[PDB]
Every structure is written in structure tokens, then in C-alpha cells.
Enzyme design. Structure first.
Site, PDB file in Angstrom:
ATOM      1  N   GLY A   1       0.821  -1.202   0.000  1.00 47.27           N
ATOM      2  CA  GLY A   1       0.000   0.000   0.000  1.00 47.27           C
ATOM      3  C   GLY A   1       0.853   1.249   0.000  1.00 47.27           C
ATOM      4  N   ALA A  58      14.188  -2.895   6.295  1.00 52.05           N
ATOM      5  CA  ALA A  58      13.938  -3.121   4.872  1.00 52.05           C
ATOM      6  C   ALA A  58      12.543  -2.641   4.488  1.00 52.05           C
ATOM      7  N   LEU A  59      12.418  -2.163   3.257  1.00 48.68           N
ATOM      8  CA  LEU A  59      11.142  -1.713   2.719  1.00 48.68           C
ATOM      9  C   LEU A  59      10.395  -2.916   2.163  1.00 48.68           C
ATOM     10  N   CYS A  80       4.340  -8.061   3.232  1.00 49.42           N
ATOM     11  CA  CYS A  80       4.310  -8.849   2.000  1.00 49.42           C
ATOM     12  C   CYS A  80       5.702  -9.278   1.540  1.00 49.42           C
ATOM     13  N   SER A 116      -1.100  -4.837   9.054  1.00 48.32           N
ATOM     14  CA  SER A 116      -1.683  -5.712  10.070  1.00 48.32           C
ATOM     15  C   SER A 116      -0.599  -6.483  10.822  1.00 48.32           C
ATOM     16  N   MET A 155      -7.629  -8.527   2.896  1.00 48.06           N
ATOM     17  CA  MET A 155      -6.281  -8.223   3.328  1.00 48.06           C
ATOM     18  C   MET A 155      -5.307  -8.856   2.349  1.00 48.06           C
ATOM     19  N   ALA A 203      -2.188  -7.939  -0.806  1.00 54.53           N
ATOM     20  CA  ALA A 203      -1.145  -7.009  -1.201  1.00 54.53           C
ATOM     21  C   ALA A 203      -1.604  -6.117  -2.345  1.00 54.53           C
ATOM     22  N   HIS A 204      -2.179  -6.716  -3.374  1.00 57.23           N
ATOM     23  CA  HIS A 204      -2.650  -5.938  -4.521  1.00 57.23           C
ATOM     24  C   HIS A 204      -3.905  -5.106  -4.236  1.00 57.23           C
ATOM     25  N   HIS A 221      -5.153 -22.844 -28.105  1.00 57.41           N
ATOM     26  CA  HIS A 221      -5.257 -24.281 -27.900  1.00 57.41           C
ATOM     27  C   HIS A 221      -3.868 -24.921 -28.047  1.00 57.41           C
TER      28      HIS A 221
HETATM   29  C1  FAD Z   1       3.210 -31.489 -34.557  1.00 57.90           C
HETATM   30  C2  FAD Z   1       2.155 -30.416 -34.620  1.00 57.90           C
HETATM   31  C3  FAD Z   1       1.912 -29.650 -33.480  1.00 57.90           C
HETATM   32  C4  FAD Z   1       0.943 -28.657 -33.488  1.00 57.90           C
HETATM   33  N1  FAD Z   1       0.736 -27.918 -32.332  1.00 57.90           N
HETATM   34  C5  FAD Z   1      -0.219 -26.924 -32.315  1.00 57.90           C
HETATM   35  C6  FAD Z   1      -0.457 -26.177 -31.155  1.00 57.90           C
HETATM   36  O1  FAD Z   1      -0.096 -26.592 -30.053  1.00 57.90           O
HETATM   37  N2  FAD Z   1      -1.425 -25.194 -31.174  1.00 57.90           N
HETATM   38  C7  FAD Z   1      -2.144 -24.932 -32.320  1.00 57.90           C
HETATM   39  O2  FAD Z   1      -2.997 -24.043 -32.326  1.00 57.90           O
HETATM   40  N3  FAD Z   1      -1.919 -25.670 -33.460  1.00 57.90           N
HETATM   41  C8  FAD Z   1      -0.953 -26.659 -33.467  1.00 57.90           C
HETATM   42  N4  FAD Z   1      -0.748 -27.396 -34.634  1.00 57.90           N
HETATM   43  C9  FAD Z   1      -1.474 -26.956 -35.872  1.00 57.90           C
HETATM   44  C10 FAD Z   1      -2.862 -27.595 -35.858  1.00 57.90           C
HETATM   45  O3  FAD Z   1      -2.756 -29.001 -35.800  1.00 57.90           O
HETATM   46  C11 FAD Z   1      -3.685 -27.181 -37.062  1.00 57.90           C
HETATM   47  O4  FAD Z   1      -3.681 -25.769 -37.145  1.00 57.90           O
HETATM   48  C12 FAD Z   1      -5.124 -27.666 -36.917  1.00 57.90           C
HETATM   49  O5  FAD Z   1      -5.176 -29.077 -36.808  1.00 57.90           O
HETATM   50  C13 FAD Z   1      -5.963 -27.193 -38.095  1.00 57.90           C
HETATM   51  O6  FAD Z   1      -7.270 -27.692 -37.938  1.00 57.90           O
HETATM   52  P1  FAD Z   1      -8.143 -28.028 -39.251  1.00 57.90           P
HETATM   53  O7  FAD Z   1      -9.493 -28.454 -38.836  1.00 57.90           O
HETATM   54  O8  FAD Z   1      -8.140 -26.876 -40.251  1.00 57.90           O
HETATM   55  O9  FAD Z   1      -7.386 -29.227 -40.002  1.00 57.90           O
HETATM   56  P2  FAD Z   1      -6.954 -30.670 -39.457  1.00 57.90           P
HETATM   57  O10 FAD Z   1      -6.762 -30.705 -37.943  1.00 57.90           O
HETATM   58  O11 FAD Z   1      -5.747 -31.077 -40.208  1.00 57.90           O
HETATM   59  O12 FAD Z   1      -8.201 -31.592 -39.864  1.00 57.90           O
HETATM   60  C14 FAD Z   1      -8.457 -31.890 -41.212  1.00 57.90           C
HETATM   61  C15 FAD Z   1      -9.028 -33.292 -41.273  1.00 57.90           C
HETATM   62  O13 FAD Z   1      -9.606 -33.474 -42.552  1.00 57.90           O
HETATM   63  C16 FAD Z   1      -9.348 -34.792 -42.981  1.00 57.90           C
HETATM   64  N5  FAD Z   1      -9.479 -34.807 -44.443  1.00 57.90           N
HETATM   65  C17 FAD Z   1      -8.719 -34.148 -45.367  1.00 57.90           C
HETATM   66  N6  FAD Z   1      -9.213 -34.404 -46.595  1.00 57.90           N
HETATM   67  C18 FAD Z   1     -10.286 -35.212 -46.470  1.00 57.90           C
HETATM   68  C19 FAD Z   1     -11.162 -35.779 -47.393  1.00 57.90           C
HETATM   69  N7  FAD Z   1     -11.261 -35.317 -48.638  1.00 57.90           N
HETATM   70  N8  FAD Z   1     -12.166 -36.572 -46.895  1.00 57.90           N
HETATM   71  C20 FAD Z   1     -12.344 -36.815 -45.556  1.00 57.90           C
HETATM   72  N9  FAD Z   1     -11.476 -36.240 -44.657  1.00 57.90           N
HETATM   73  C21 FAD Z   1     -10.466 -35.472 -45.120  1.00 57.90           C
HETATM   74  C22 FAD Z   1      -7.974 -35.118 -42.425  1.00 57.90           C
HETATM   75  O14 FAD Z   1      -7.766 -36.504 -42.282  1.00 57.90           O
HETATM   76  C23 FAD Z   1      -7.969 -34.373 -41.097  1.00 57.90           C
HETATM   77  O15 FAD Z   1      -8.333 -35.176 -39.998  1.00 57.90           O
HETATM   78  C24 FAD Z   1       0.211 -28.402 -34.649  1.00 57.90           C
HETATM   79  C25 FAD Z   1       0.453 -29.174 -35.798  1.00 57.90           C
HETATM   80  C26 FAD Z   1       1.425 -30.182 -35.782  1.00 57.90           C
HETATM   81  C27 FAD Z   1       1.393 -31.223 -36.871  1.00 57.90           C
HETATM   82  C1  FAD Z   2       2.821 -15.443   5.374  1.00 59.00           C
HETATM   83  C2  FAD Z   2       1.940 -14.492   4.606  1.00 59.00           C
HETATM   84  C3  FAD Z   2       1.731 -14.733   3.241  1.00 59.00           C
HETATM   85  C4  FAD Z   2       0.999 -13.820   2.476  1.00 59.00           C
HETATM   86  N1  FAD Z   2       0.800 -14.078   1.121  1.00 59.00           N
HETATM   87  C5  FAD Z   2       0.073 -13.177   0.360  1.00 59.00           C
HETATM   88  C6  FAD Z   2      -0.145 -13.398  -0.999  1.00 59.00           C
HETATM   89  O1  FAD Z   2       0.464 -14.263  -1.606  1.00 59.00           O
HETATM   90  N2  FAD Z   2      -0.867 -12.496  -1.748  1.00 59.00           N
HETATM   91  C7  FAD Z   2      -1.398 -11.372  -1.169  1.00 59.00           C
HETATM   92  O2  FAD Z   2      -2.050 -10.585  -1.863  1.00 59.00           O
HETATM   93  N3  FAD Z   2      -1.199 -11.139   0.175  1.00 59.00           N
HETATM   94  C8  FAD Z   2      -0.466 -12.035   0.949  1.00 59.00           C
HETATM   95  N4  FAD Z   2      -0.280 -11.778   2.300  1.00 59.00           N
HETATM   96  C9  FAD Z   2      -0.986 -10.588   2.897  1.00 59.00           C
HETATM   97  C10 FAD Z   2      -0.129  -9.346   2.639  1.00 59.00           C
HETATM   98  O3  FAD Z   2       1.157  -9.496   3.220  1.00 59.00           O
HETATM   99  C11 FAD Z   2      -0.805  -8.066   3.121  1.00 59.00           C
HETATM  100  O4  FAD Z   2      -2.118  -7.996   2.599  1.00 59.00           O
HETATM  101  C12 FAD Z   2      -0.039  -6.834   2.653  1.00 59.00           C
HETATM  102  O5  FAD Z   2       1.283  -6.865   3.133  1.00 59.00           O
HETATM  103  C13 FAD Z   2      -0.759  -5.553   3.089  1.00 59.00           C
HETATM  104  O6  FAD Z   2      -0.002  -4.421   2.721  1.00 59.00           O
HETATM  105  P1  FAD Z   2      -0.066  -3.075   3.597  1.00 59.00           P
HETATM  106  O7  FAD Z   2       0.739  -2.015   2.918  1.00 59.00           O
HETATM  107  O8  FAD Z   2      -1.498  -2.706   3.940  1.00 59.00           O
HETATM  108  O9  FAD Z   2       0.638  -3.421   5.007  1.00 59.00           O
HETATM  109  P2  FAD Z   2       2.074  -4.099   5.282  1.00 59.00           P
HETATM  110  O10 FAD Z   2       2.612  -4.917   4.101  1.00 59.00           O
HETATM  111  O11 FAD Z   2       1.909  -4.896   6.521  1.00 59.00           O
HETATM  112  O12 FAD Z   2       3.012  -2.840   5.597  1.00 59.00           O
HETATM  113  C14 FAD Z   2       2.814  -2.101   6.777  1.00 59.00           C
HETATM  114  C15 FAD Z   2       4.159  -1.534   7.178  1.00 59.00           C
HETATM  115  O13 FAD Z   2       3.935  -0.479   8.091  1.00 59.00           O
HETATM  116  C16 FAD Z   2       4.956  -0.499   9.064  1.00 59.00           C
HETATM  117  N5  FAD Z   2       4.444   0.251  10.215  1.00 59.00           N
HETATM  118  C17 FAD Z   2       3.348  -0.025  10.992  1.00 59.00           C
HETATM  119  N6  FAD Z   2       3.202   0.958  11.900  1.00 59.00           N
HETATM  120  C18 FAD Z   2       4.193   1.860  11.713  1.00 59.00           C
HETATM  121  C19 FAD Z   2       4.527   3.050  12.355  1.00 59.00           C
HETATM  122  N7  FAD Z   2       3.746   3.611  13.275  1.00 59.00           N
HETATM  123  N8  FAD Z   2       5.619   3.740  11.895  1.00 59.00           N
HETATM  124  C20 FAD Z   2       6.383   3.306  10.841  1.00 59.00           C
HETATM  125  N9  FAD Z   2       6.040   2.131  10.205  1.00 59.00           N
HETATM  126  C21 FAD Z   2       4.973   1.430  10.651  1.00 59.00           C
HETATM  127  C22 FAD Z   2       5.266  -1.972   9.271  1.00 59.00           C
HETATM  128  O14 FAD Z   2       6.585  -2.175   9.726  1.00 59.00           O
HETATM  129  C23 FAD Z   2       5.046  -2.554   7.889  1.00 59.00           C
HETATM  130  O15 FAD Z   2       6.268  -2.699   7.200  1.00 59.00           O
HETATM  131  C24 FAD Z   2       0.465 -12.674   3.071  1.00 59.00           C
HETATM  132  C25 FAD Z   2       0.689 -12.437   4.433  1.00 59.00           C
HETATM  133  C26 FAD Z   2       1.423 -13.344   5.198  1.00 59.00           C
HETATM  134  C27 FAD Z   2       1.888 -12.895   6.560  1.00 59.00           C
END
Ligand code: FAD
Ligand code: FAD
Lengths: 455, 455
Positions: free
Chosen positions: A12, A35-36, A40, A139, A308, A310-311, A434
Site C-alpha cells: 500500500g 527493509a522496505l 508482503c 496488520s 487483506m 497485497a494488490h 489451444h
Molecule cells: C506437430 C504439430 C503440433 C501442433 N501444435 C499446435 C499447437 O499446439 N497449437 C495450435 O494451435 N496448433 C498446433 N498445430 C497446428 C494444428 O494441428 C492445425 O492448425 C489444426 O489441426 C488445423 O485444424 P483443421 O481443422 O483446419 O485441419 P486438421 O486438424 O488437419 O483436420 C483436417 C481433417 O480433414 C481430414 N481430411 C482431409 N481431406 C479429407 C477428405 N477429402 N475426406 C475426408 N477427410 C479429409 C484429415 O484426415 C484431417 O483429420 C500443430 C500441428 C502439428 C502437426
Molecule cells: C505469510 C503471509 C503470506 C501472504 N501471502 C500473500 C499473498 O500471496 N498475496 C497477497 O495478496 N497477500 C499475501 N499476504 C498478505 C499481505 O502481506 C498483506 O495484505 C499486505 O502486506 C498488506 O499491505 P499493507 O501495505 O497494507 O501493510 P504491510 O505490508 O503490513 O506494511 C505495513 C508496514 O507499516 C509499518 N508500520 C506499521 N506501523 C508503523 C509506524 N507507526 N511507523 C512506521 N512504520 C509502521 C510496518 O513495519 C510494515 O512494514 C500474506 C501475508 C502473510 C503474513
């Protein structure tokens, strides 16, 4: 004097400061930690995600990889923790870089209000004045009086990021995001993990369907999850700790993580000197432009209402400083995702079914399972789903929710769609690569609109 | 008779058939191969992504996992290929399920036009009539006369998906998506891979900056990539194959993959009996509604102009049948992503910089590197970037391009933004989960618009 003085350098505060500089403000920032980056960066999001990403790879290799025999995978805890620390170091140094680049002045110390326009840095003795003040103090872990936290055997999230060895038995008290994530981290490394939650489900901010699915997945993975259980005590022992439950049951473990929530932190701020006070939950009340009742003082992040996250905090920081300068700002709370960074990921954006039903809004449900996804199949993932909720009359997307591999990454697009006030039809008609996990969102959206192609 | 007869059951044909049935048409589909799903499902997208995802995990384990000591990893090629086959089989059976569900009739054989309205299924002798005919016959591997493909030692993509052992040396002739993907698969399994390309760059449909980065990354992984070289012959030998280059150089390898492109496929179709012909590239010319010059005959996918992608084919399938029934239908070619499913992933959507310069469109460049990303760093990723191109006057997103871990997933959001004809500002302002790779896109968008927060 400063145009803007920011208290706290979390998501905050530090983002608000950079945006304010971009808008032409002279900005100062007070932060008490060296430390600042706030909770959190230092002890929160960043270190936890470092542990989650790395342990996830380790865990999958231990279970076995498709098309290979892994002869051995040994945890290297020093190396695991070194990676965590290096990631944190790089991020905190990045904030330092950006402060210097943007000409933001930084003060180290505890800021305390002297008046509505003046703040004492207690350690340096400096008195700082500003036109606008932005409270971003964040807190702290909620430690109920029955939990005897010694930061050794009974711990908070901070210590759970840095256990000196894998706990043979770990109990997580609390079934929220933070505890579940840290539970999973140590479970992956061989810990027997038990999660105790008082409410009748885990991850209460998620859609109920997703909460239920998450519980099933974590049980399958080997965590013990027990909902509807009230913990009455947590006590350290000589070489472990006990957890007492209502009714007499006592659990024992090597470490217990107390993660039952976080409470807005205003200790030492003397809010009263600015004419401000906290509500019943410790939050500083703010209006829709993030102003407190004293109009030139704003508050954001974990210290005010809302998710309570951090964000969330950073977006509020942006809106606050944009309002200061231009007189207009806004956060789209319905487009803010909430994510759990386990595997599978768990996420929510916009309204849950529960919220829609409570508000009386009529909706359609579209759902597409990971089991029908070409890409998910290719990865060896079959479990999970994404669900799109759309208005029954307008087709406006109201919310998106999911559980599955990388579902947080997928729902980045869902959050954008919500920000764009998209219809389910428009999300579902948009091109999607995908094979990709995004096609799960596409088909879910089509299903909410009318009907999908692939169900 | 049929309302619609579809020739080909690939992404174009099979999706068109489902959409047509949804619109109330009586649909028949002719497909010559036994299995439905076309090139994509049988021998394309699906098997290749199965191999890519699984070899990626094996390859990471071989290189080392952060926070672990990993012993050597032993390849199990029968297990790898079994997974591939299982994924393909689930996908083709899925298409069968959907045909039966939607009441689509299927014929097995080669379709061949008898007239503009009648088609012979040669192997069953059936003469099929329809009101509308949709040609979705796809493509086939381009085999230049100098390439002596024996489908054993000198092969196409189909055989390269199923090599009986890892080739000690593999040469890939052609630096496009399919060849590079398959080169990477075998390289991960221990093959010495050399990629030869005639043009001065690999991945010619990508933005030139992205092509250059890809070449650098794959060389660093250990592929030999040689651009600017003309292969003049490929000939099978007794236990291998040779590749001759212009000027006399001869390379030798255990297998050679000829992947220099794919050609629109209309063999056996007798297009002339429908009053139709192919242009110089073998494509069936179509208008903006995908109609041939005979207005009740449509053509889509790889057999017509445009990117030879599965989702491009299926989108054209939807648009064609929506034109048949309603007179509407639309394909947003500017929103279709093209992705390479290596690690890092490589992606493009909308216009490249080369296309913008050729068209004289003024633009701004916004770029954010993976090195500045909290999430990327947590994963152990530092290399890559996302680049947003925005119109200099209107700020309209014109194109988004990247290379990095999971960049294709991240750019799902970019495709949506392009579909919505959004600006860089719109995208950059949207909430994004922290910490997530999506923040890389957010910051790149803000940089295109004006300036990011985190640079
Ligand atoms: C190794 C690899 C990894 C990939 N990884 C990703 C990825 O992670 N993310 C991503 O978005 N894309 C990925 N792709 C690309 C993705 O596979 C294609 O963009 C996607 O499949 C296209 O969908 P489509 O429906 O246009 O064609 P296709 O998925 O190729 O489907 C066409 C179908 O039509 C059939 N067909 C063709 N002609 C005829 C016919 N005349 N009669 C009956 N059936 C027919 C074929 O047998 C086939 O099953 C990857 C491709 C490869 C090969
Ligand atoms: C173990 C644990 C894990 C957590 N994990 C997450 C998480 O992953 N995500 C999340 O969003 N929140 C998490 N939190 C909660 C998070 O830490 C708090 O919500 C957050 O720190 C609040 O920020 P703040 O500025 O209000 O107060 P603080 O971060 O507590 O800061 C207050 C500061 O004011 C100082 N102070 C107090 N009084 C005085 C004074 N009179 N004079 C000078 N300085 C003073 C203190 O020393 C302290 O440093 C976690 C908390 C704990 C303890």
C-alpha cells in the site's frame, strides 16, 4: 514540507509513494523496519511463494514424474532457505532502487501523530509535516490470549517460514489462506500436518463449492483437516507444544502455527492526536475515496476494511494519491482476485454464489472441469474446475471461481473480464490458445452464457 | 439431406459441427482417418504438448531442483509414450462423445465432390447431399522434392512424436514452431539437436525481438541453431541420414525431421467438380464470411488463408456456421494468440513491430522483464519479458509479445484485451494478483501507456 507523508512501506505505502511521485508530489515515507516492502515482501507473499514454488517441484519429483524414474530427491533445507532469502533480498533492494529513482525521501522509525498535520519519527526525533498523510500501517498476527506464542515452539507465520528443521508433527491452528499454504509447504517436506478450524469449512473467503473441493484435495494429499473444532489453549512444552480442544482432547506436535487471522495494526501511532480512532475490529474507518474523517488523512490496505491482500493495498494506494492530486479515484473491488498458491491453486474473483444469494441477484452457473481439458490431461492434471457466475438477465459476469493447476494464472483473465464489465458471452467468444488452461475459463464462460462446445 | 455436411473432423470441422447442431442444423461429418480430432488431436497439438509438458519436468529434475539434492534421472520412453497415447485417446473419445451427444452423423472415408451439392464418400459408396458444405480438410507436411522422406530415418512431425529410442543426433530442417518444439522434446531426453533454417531468424511469425531472444535461449539450453542456411538435400542412409547444405557441407544424424512448413490439403477432394479451385499456395480462396466463390460452400482452418492454428480453425468454424444460420459470424484475427510450448514459452498476439512499421502505424513500446518479477524470482526464473505495443495517439493495444515461463498463459489476458479493443491504460490499471506472472503484463501495459510503477 512534504506534499505527502506515507506511514508504512508495504504494498500500500510504497506503491502509493511511487505513484504520488509520478503525479508530481514531494513524498516522504516513514517505516520502522529496516527493509522496505512491508509484511508482503519481508515475511509474507514473497518468502511464502518462494517456499511454495520450490517445494511444489520437490514434492512432484518425490511422488514420481511421468516418463522417468527419479532415483532420489533429498531436501536441502539450507539451500531452500537460501533461495527464499535471496528472493526477498532482491525484492526489498528493488523497492529501495525505485524510491531513489522517484526521489522519495525515507525515514526509519516509528511514526506517531503529534497533530493532524505533524508526525514524530520517535527514533530520529524528527518532526515531519505534510499536506496529506497516508496511513498504511498494515496488520499483525492475531494472537488470542489462550495461545501462548513463544516464537519458538508455538509460532506465527514469520517463524513458520524459517523452521530450522522439518517438524515431524505440525499443527496449524486456523484454516485460512496463510496457515494452509504454510501447512502445505512443510507437508511436502515430510511433516505430518494437522489443520484445526473453528468454522465448518476452510478458506472462508472462497466460494463454498471451492472451499469444499479444497478440503477434499488437501485430505487426499495427506493433510489432516478438522473443521468445527474450537481450540481452547496452545502451550509450549520442553521439546514440543500441546493444543487443547473444547471437550478435553489434547494434541501434541513439534511446532504449532497460530494462524487464526490478522488484525489491523495501529500500535504506537497515537491516532487520537490526529482526531482519529479505530472501530471495533481495529480498522481505521474510511469513505469511498479512502479518506478518514479528517479529510487530508487517508488510510489503505490491511489497516482498513476489505480483503487483506497485497494488490488490494496497492490499488488503494494508487486511488488514494490520485484522489489527493486530481480529486477523483476508485478501486474496482469486484475485479480483485484472491488466490491460494498451493497446488492445485484455489481462487476467487467478484461475488461468490453465497454473496449473490444473500443480495437476491439472479444468476446462471457455468462450470468446466479440468478433466475435460486437453492441456490439463497433457500435464497429468485431471482434478479441478472453473465456474463462471453471470447475471440471469444481463449476462454480466458477476464472479469467477476455481480450483486446479495454475488456476490463479488462468483467473488473471477473469479478473480483467470483470474489470471490463464483460458478459459471459464476450469472455466465451474471445479467442483462446489451444491447448491451454485458459480454454477451461472460455468453456465455463460459454456454459454460463448459454452452453459450452465441449460438454 | 443434411443441412450441413462438414469435410474433415479437425478443430475446424468438429467444432463447426457441434456449433451447427446447437443452432439446430442436421449435420453430417466425413473424415477419412478412423479417429476424430484431426491433425491437432491425433498427431499435432495434443501429443506434442503431452511430450513437452512431461519432458519439461524431467529436464528440470536433471538440471537440479532448488532446495534439493537430486540424483540422476532415468528416462522411461515406453512410459512417456504411453502417457502421450492415453492423452490422445481421451481427447479423440471426447470428440466421439460430443458428436453422439449433439446428434452429429459421422461417415468414414475420403469425401470427393461430385457436384456443388453432392459428395461421394468413396469407401462406403455413399452419395451425400447438403444445403451447406464446409471444407475443413486441413493441411499436410510440406515435403520439398530434395527431401527424401522414408518415414523412418528422414521423417515428418508425426514420426518424430514416436521415435522408438532417443536419437543420439537429431537434425531438424526448419526453424518454425513445430520443428523447434520437437527439437526441444528430444534434446531434453539427451539428443544432440541441430536446427537449420533458411531465413535469418527462427520462429518467423513472432515479433523479431522475440525470435532473437528465443534463439539465444535455446542455444544456451544446448541446441545448435543455424540460420541463413539452405539445405539442398536430405537422404536416408543405412543407419541414419545426411543433410547436404548449399556449398558442400554435409551433416549426419540418426534421424532428420523435415519440418519446413505445412501445405493446405485438398488431395482427393475433386474441388473442380464443386466449381472451385485453389490459389498458388494450395489454399481455397474465401471472403470475409468464409464463403468460397460458390456461396453455399464454406472453407476454414488450415486449408484457407491465415495462421495455421487449431483455435484459428475452430473460431472460423463457429463463424462459418453462424453465417449459414443467422447471416452473422465474426473472427477477430487480431486477438488470436500464437504460442510456442517450450520452456520458456514464446508468444505473440496482434501486430508485431515489423507489421506496425510496414503499415506506418505510430506506436509506443512498453516492456517489463521477468527479472523484475517477484513471482518469477520465487520460481527461480529471471529470463524473459513481455512487450506491449500501443498506438501513439489512441493508446489502443496493437500487439502483445513475450518469452518466459508460462508466457502463453499470461498472454491469454492480452488476447482478451485485444478482443475488447482495450487500451494499454485499461489493461495496466486492472487489478492483478500479487505475486503473479500476470503482473509482468500489467507493468508492460502501463509502460506502453505512459510509465510502470516497478521500473
Ligand atoms: C506437430 C504439430 C503440433 C501442433 N501444435 C499446435 C499447437 O499446439 N497449437 C495450435 O494451435 N496448433 C498446433 N498445430 C497446428 C494444428 O494441428 C492445425 O492448425 C489444426 O489441426 C488445423 O485444424 P483443421 O481443422 O483446419 O485441419 P486438421 O486438424 O488437419 O483436420 C483436417 C481433417 O480433414 C481430414 N481430411 C482431409 N481431406 C479429407 C477428405 N477429402 N475426406 C475426408 N477427410 C479429409 C484429415 O484426415 C484431417 O483429420 C500443430 C500441428 C502439428 C502437426
Ligand atoms: C505469510 C503471509 C503470506 C501472504 N501471502 C500473500 C499473498 O500471496 N498475496 C497477497 O495478496 N497477500 C499475501 N499476504 C498478505 C499481505 O502481506 C498483506 O495484505 C499486505 O502486506 C498488506 O499491505 P499493507 O501495505 O497494507 O501493510 P504491510 O505490508 O503490513 O506494511 C505495513 C508496514 O507499516 C509499518 N508500520 C506499521 N506501523 C508503523 C509506524 N507507526 N511507523 C512506521 N512504520 C509502521 C510496518 O513495519 C510494515 O512494514 C500474506 C501475508 C502473510 C503474513
Amino acid at each position: 514540507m512534504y506534499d505527502l507523508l506515507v506511514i508504512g512501506a508495504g504494498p500500500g505505502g510504497y506503491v502509493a509513494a511511487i505513484r504520488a511521485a509520478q503525479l508530481g508530489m514531494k513524498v516522504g515515507v516513514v517505516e520502522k523496519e529496516k527493509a522496505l516492502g512491508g509484511t508482503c515482501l519481508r515475511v509474507g507473499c514473497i518468502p511464502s511463494k518462494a517456499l511454495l514454488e520450490t517445494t511444489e517441484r520437490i514434492y512432484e519429483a518425490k511422488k514420481g514424474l511421468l516418463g522417468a524414474k527419479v532415483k532420489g530427491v533429498e531436501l536441502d533445507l539450507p539451500a531452500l532457505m537460501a533461495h527464499k532469502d535471496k528472493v526477498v533480498q532482491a525484492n526489498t533492494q528493488g523497492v529501495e532502487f525505485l524510491f531513489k529513482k522517484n526521489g522519495i525521501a525515507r525515514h526509519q522509525g516509528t511514526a506517531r501523530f503529534l497533530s493532524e498535520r505533524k508526525v514524530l519519527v520517535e527514533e530520529t526525533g524528527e518532526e515531519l509535516e505534510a499536506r496529506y498523510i497516508l496511513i498504511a500501517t498494515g496488520s499483525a498476527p492475531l494472537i488470542p490470549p489462550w495461545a501462548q506464542v513463544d516464537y519458538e515452539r508455538v509460532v506465527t507465520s514469520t517463524e513458520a517460514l524459517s523452521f530450522p528443521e522439518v517438524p515431524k508433527r505440525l499443527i496449524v491452528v486456523g484454516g485460512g489462506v496463510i496457515g494452509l499454504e504454510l501447512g502445505v509447504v512443510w507437508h511436502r517436506l515430510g511433516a505430518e500436518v494437522i489443520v484445526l478450524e473453528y468454522m465448518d469449512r476452510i478458506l472462508p473467503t472462497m466460494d463454498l463449492e471451492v472451499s469444499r473441493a479444497a478440503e477434499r484435495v488437501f485430505k487426499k494429499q495427506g493433510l489432516t483437516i478438522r473443521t468445527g473444532v474450537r481450540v481452547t489453549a496452545v502451550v509450549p512444552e520442553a521439546k514440543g507444544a500441546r493444543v487443547e480442544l473444547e471437550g478435553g482432547e489434547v494434541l501434541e506436535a513439534d511446532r504449532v502455527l497460530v494462524a487464526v487471522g490478522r488484525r489491523p495494526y495501529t500500535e504506537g501511532l497515537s491516532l487520537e492526536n490526529a482526531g482519529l480512532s479505530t472501530d471495533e475490529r481495529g480498522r481505521i474507518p474510511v469513505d469511498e475515496h479512502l479518506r478518514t474523517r479528517v479529510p487530508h488523512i487517508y488510510a489503505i490496505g490491511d489497516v482498513v476494511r476489505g480483503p487483506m491482500l497485497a494488490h488490494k493495498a496497492s490499488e488503494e494506494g494508487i486511488a488514494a494519491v490520485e484522489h489527493m492530486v486530481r480529486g477523483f479515484g476508485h478501486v474496482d473491488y469486484q475485479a480483485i482476485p484472491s488466490v491460494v498458491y498451493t497446488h492445485p491453486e484455489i481462487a476467487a474473483v467478484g461475488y461468490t454464489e453465497e454473496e449473490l444469494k444473500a443480495q437476491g441477484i439472479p444468476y446462471k452457473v457455468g462450470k468446466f472441469p479440468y478433466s475435460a481439458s486437453g492441456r490439463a490431461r497433457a500435464m497429468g492434471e485431471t482434478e479441478g474446475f472453473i465456474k463462471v457466475l453471470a447475471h440471469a438477465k444481463t449476462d454480466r459476469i458477476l464472479g469467477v471461481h476455481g480450483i486446479g493447476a495454475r488456476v490463479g494464472d488462468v483467473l488473471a483473465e477473469a479478473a480483467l473480464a470483470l474489470f471490463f464489465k464483460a458478459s459471459a458471452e464476450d469472455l466465451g467468444r474471445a479467442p483462446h490458445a489451444h491447448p491451454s488452461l485458459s480454454e477451461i475459463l472460455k468453456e465455463a464462460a460459454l456454459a454460463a452464457w448459454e452452453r459450452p462446445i465441449h460438454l
